[PDB]
Amino acid sequence: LDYLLAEIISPNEDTNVIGYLAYYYPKLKNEQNVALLTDFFLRCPTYFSHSNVVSLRNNYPVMEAFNYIMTTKFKVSQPTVPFYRFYAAVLASLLNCEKTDPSHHWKLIPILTGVLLSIKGRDDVELYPDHSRSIKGSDTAVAQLLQRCLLRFYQSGDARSYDLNALVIISMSCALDYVEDDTIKKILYCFNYTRAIIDLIYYSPYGLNDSDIPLLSDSSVNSQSFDQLLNNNPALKHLNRLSFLFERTVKLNDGSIQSNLNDIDISLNKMQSFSEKLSKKISVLDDDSSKGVGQLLRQCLYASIIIHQAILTTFFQLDNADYTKYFLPSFSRKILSILFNLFFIVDRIGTGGFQPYNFVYLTCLQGIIQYDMKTAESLVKTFTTGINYSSLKDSEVARAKLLFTLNLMEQIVNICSDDLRLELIVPLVEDLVNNKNACVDIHNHVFKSIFESAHSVILKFFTVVDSSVKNVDYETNVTLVSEKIIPYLTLVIDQFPEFLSINQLDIAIETISRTVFPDSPIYSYDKNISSMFLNVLFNKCLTKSRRSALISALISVFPLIPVKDYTKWLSIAFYDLIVATPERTERAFLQERLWDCVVGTNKYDPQKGNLGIMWWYENVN
Structure with missing residues (x-):
């Protein structure tokens, strides 16, 4: 043996004392020798000489080592030296350290942590060992000893050592469940x-x-x-x-x-x-x-x-x-700036499902929106200063940044200042969805989310006219939405379904129809934008199925059509589009959609809805 013992007291530069220990502890055939080894191990100067020169890299592994040692010793079946006795021998030695050594605290903490980590691994092997009364005793002793050691350490002055503090902080994180609240409280009263x-x-x-x-x-x-x-x-x-x-x-x-x-x-x-x-x-x-x-x-x-x-x-x-x-x-x-920079990692989990992330993000966003809109605007300005086409091609980081930025613009485009919505947000998302920048092809697979999110921004932009925040010249916003609304409709249809799904089509027509049809600032400004809406959508219906989806969507907007024109469009849909549909299953589907719009008209305006029911039973068998 003692060949080992002597090498522990005075190592070389190539002796690996911890490795030796993980080896010999489980194989020792006599109880005294276990205590001896432990006793000698606590004198080893590679780990336990002066607190000034101790290294985190040297001492940290002691934690894993003792995790290892205890677990594998508990595993050995029919060992010459039973586990309970093995453990009593180690503990006697740790306790002797505490009594005699005024620097016992940082020395013992990784060891105690280690021994504690091993407790879980036992449940996997067996819960009812033959001498569990001893073991429970020993476990309590270790946990109690850990409390004393953590407190003495922070009371010692040795927490001023950068390395020892790291060592104890890490040990507490691995032993956290065994650290009592009073220990922590008493520590914080001190350091x-x-x-x-x-x-x-x-x-x-x-x-x-x-x-x-x-x-x-x-x-x-x-x-x-x-x-x-x-x-x-x-x-x-x-x-x-x-x-x-x-x-x-x-x-x-x-x-x-x-x-x-x-x-x-x-x-x-x-x-x-x-x-x-x-x-x-x-x-x-x-x-x-x-x-x-x-x-x-x-x-x-x-x-x-x-x-x-x-x-x-x-x-x-x-x-x-x-x-x-x-x-x-x-x-x-600060927090949003951190999430912006880390968004690429987040993108690979998924926002939805992960409560803490959403809690943090929403709390911060709702915070700045409610009490300081100038902060949100600055964040956006800063976020869009540092992004570039070259990076967008090369970097998933730059792409997640743009995503994050567009998600944020979606949340404020309808309540922020004119300067930010008009001279920055809207130009950008117009450029993205129209693919106007030849430096990048926005239909590349890697830009799916960016493109989808740019669309969401435009949609919210239209709702600007319903908000009621000050320092926003509503005449201008109304004029400009009037100019863009129909070109954007054309685009969305053109992009359906190659680049847009049925859901995205349905949302875009819900939002645009609601923007341009009556009881709306757009209608009161120019009723004729409604008309163009129907003209354009009707026409693409002529030119599962794509056609089926476009008619289904045309029909969806009928509730909003003013009374003078309402049954007119019912006829147009039924005669020009539905009966002109060759196959039963599709003709039947569109007919049931025309009915839904009559029923839905009724929910929204009973009296116009009745004109529908009248038209229905006068035209449809």
């Missing part, structure tokens, strides 16, 4: 490690390092290079757990409002810095996101979101909307 969690994730060289990681920019990542990254940057193995440590910690913090709001600004500036840099690093990810850079950047986004949610929910504890008005806009500028 607030909240800012350091954000630092460790986003800025630290042990984490994402402000995104300055070569590997992220590498088009063909070896799994060995990735494993080497995770060992050099151990925080990257725990972004999620760290976010949870943050979530739970920030809730038990009793600090002043000024300082809580200042902690939020600092956290958000670091996250924005990482995210803005990250976008200059990457243009394309590979398709699997269950491994390597994809899994990592995904985990990074979940973490940033959990973090934003905790920031927002704790800020809402204030329960006072004057604070929301005064402060949320500025937080929202």
Whole structure:
């Protein structure tokens, strides 16, 4: 044995003490020797000499090692030394460390964490071992010991060490369920490690390092290079757990409002810095996101979101909307800027379904819309300054940025200022859907979402005339919608169904019909735009089935037709389009649609609806 023992007390530069340990612990044939090894291990100077010179890279693995050691020892069947006795031997040694060593705290914390992680792995193997009373005792001792160690550490002065704090912060994230609320509370009365969690994730060289990681920019990542990254940057193995440590910690913090709001600004500036840099690093990810850079950047986004949610929910504890008005806009500028820069990752999950993301996004958007529209307009202006056709072709990042930007314009185009809607948003989405920029072919597959979203913006733009915000010259908006509405209708029909679906056709005709037909600012301005609407749509009906869908859609707008012209168009539809339809199943479908429009006319205007019923039973068998 002692060949090993002596090498632990004075290693070389090539001895791997942890590796030795994972090897020999499970194979030891005698109980005393287990305690001995542990005793000697705690003297090893590679890990446990001076606190000034200890390295996170050296000490962090002790955590995994003990996770490993405990789990595999519990697995060995019929071992010469039973598990309970093995565990009692390790614990006696940890406890002896606590008694005799004034620097026991940061030394023991990874070991305790490790041993604790092993508890889950037991349930998989067996829940009823022969001596579980001992084991339960030992587990409690370890958890209790961990509480003492975490508190003594933050009370020691050693949390001022950048490396040891990282080590303990990571250990707490892996042991979080075993850390009691009073431990955390008592720690925060002494040293607030909240800012350091954000630092460790986003800025630290042990984490994402402000995104300055070569590997992220590498088009063909070896799994060995990735494993080497995770060992050099151990925080990257725990972004999620760290976010949870943050979530739970920030809730038990009793600090002043000024300082809580200042902690939020600092956290958000670091996250924005990482995210803005990250976008200059990457243009394309590979398709699997269950491994390597994809899994990592995904985990990074979940973490940033959990973090934003905790920031927002704790800020809402204030329960006072004057604070929301005064402060949320500025937080929202930052949070939306982070989501903009990370949108490419989000795009590969899907917005819908993922409650936290939507909570964060909507809270921030509703915030800026309700209390500071100038922030939203600035965000849009900034977002569209930094995008270019070349990047749109090369980069999934630039494309997700444009998407994110268009999704935001969709949300404010009808309530923002004239300058932004007219001189910026509308020119852009007209250019996209018409494909006017020869630098890019907008019908390329990669631009599907951009194109779809540009259409949504135009649609909302038309509703500008119903909104009632000030500093928007309604005559101008009415004139301009009047000029564009019918050309856009023509376009939408032309693009159906090659580039547009039935749903998108139905929505566009719902919205445009509602814009131009009566009880509307457009109608009161120029009744003749209604007429052109029907002329154009009727004509394309002549020139499942596409024709079926266009008539179905023409018929859909009949409720809105003024009384003088209403039954006229019923006839036009029935005689010119429906009976002129050769096949029964399609003729029958369109006939049932003509009925639906009569019924729907009735829901909306009983008296015009009755002209329909009269026309129906005078014309249709």
